[PDB]
Design a protein around this ligand. Structure first.
Ligand SMILES: [Mn+2]
Length: 206
DNA sequence: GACATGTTGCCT
DNA sequence: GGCAAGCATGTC
């Protein structure tokens, strides 16, 4: 096989917007306790800018017991429970209270384990339903709160390997964020034409 | 203590 | 497309 490295501090240490864009095409890897490796290529992200960003948990520089990952070194995971039953996986970027939400993956390896984790553990699921959402991907990759405040550059259960297929400048759609002035600002980024994206913005494309 | 707020699967 | 169940969390 190929000599496989992992993306380190050099990659994670950049402003939220650049990082959110740079994530596109990269491959998120999860190794389960049973030895099974799961792989998914990132196709959709969101940038949360910090104290000025009225949609971010760090708005006005607010630091709570929950959002501490956002104020820790670039690469630190911020995993929180939303709607009492779902997880959102964020990665701290460079900049006070700034992070990036992972929204969607193209599933590449371990799809049958993903389908079990998505259906057998809670509530035939098509391949498109596996990772097409921030909380869907957390379920499919077995991400929960025990992953909160871990370092994505150093952790032996979850890492980021560099992807062979990365989009260039014109292939990236900058659109409004999902479920959030700061509601309308284009801080969501996804691969144009990808069937694995959670929500298509047909207005921000045309 | 109260209570407002924050994605997915089904349904309209 | 619309619609809330879900309960963790933050705030008063
Ligand atoms: Mn509700």
């Amino acid at each position: 096989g190929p000599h496989m490295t992992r993306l380190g501090l050099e990659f994670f240490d950049q402003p939220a917007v650049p990082l959110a864009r740079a994530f596109l095409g990269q491959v998120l890897v999860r190794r389960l306790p049973n030895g099974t490796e799961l792989r998914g290529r990132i196709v959709e992200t969101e940038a949360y800018l910090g104290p000025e960003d009225e949609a971010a948990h760090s708005r006005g520089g607010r630091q709570t017991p929950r959002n501490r990952g956002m104020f820790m070194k670039p690469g630190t995971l911020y995993v929180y429970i939303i709607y009492g039953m779902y997880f959102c996986m964020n990665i701290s970027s460079q900049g006070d209270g700034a992070c990036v939400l992972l929204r969607a993956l193209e599933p590449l390896e371990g799809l049958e384990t993903m389908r079990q984790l998505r259906s057998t553990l809670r509530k035939v699921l098509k391949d498109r339903e596996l990772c097409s959402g921030p909380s869907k991907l957390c379920q499919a990759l077995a991400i929960n709160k025990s992953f909160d405040q871990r370092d994505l550059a150093q952790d032996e259960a979850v890492w980021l390997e560099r992807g062979p297929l990365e989009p260039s400048e014109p292939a990236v759609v900058a659109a409004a964020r999902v479920g959030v002035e700061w509601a309308r600002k284009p801080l969501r980024f996804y691969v144009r034409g990808s069937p694995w994206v959670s929500v298509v913005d047909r207005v921000a494309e045309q």
